[PDB]
Amino acid sequence: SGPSCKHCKDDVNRLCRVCACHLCGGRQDPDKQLMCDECDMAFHIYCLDPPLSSVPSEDEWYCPECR
C-alpha cells in the first residue's frame, strides 16, 4: 500500500513539508519533530519561531497553525 506520502513518494533524499518538518521539509532529528495534535504536521523544535529548546512535557501540543 506504500508509499505513505504521495507528495515525496517517501524519497528520503527529498525534502517534504507534508510528511517531514512542515517548516523546513527536513527529515533529520525525528525525536525533535513535534507532531501537532490537531493537523498532525511535524515541526522541528528548532524551526519553530521562537524555537523551543526542548520537546514539551505536556501530553498534547498544538502547532502555530492550530493555535
Binding site: P30, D31, M35, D37, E58, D59
Partner: peptide
Amino acid sequence: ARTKQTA
C-alpha cells in the same frame, strides 16, 4: 508531546 519518532 508526540514526536515523529514516537508516531
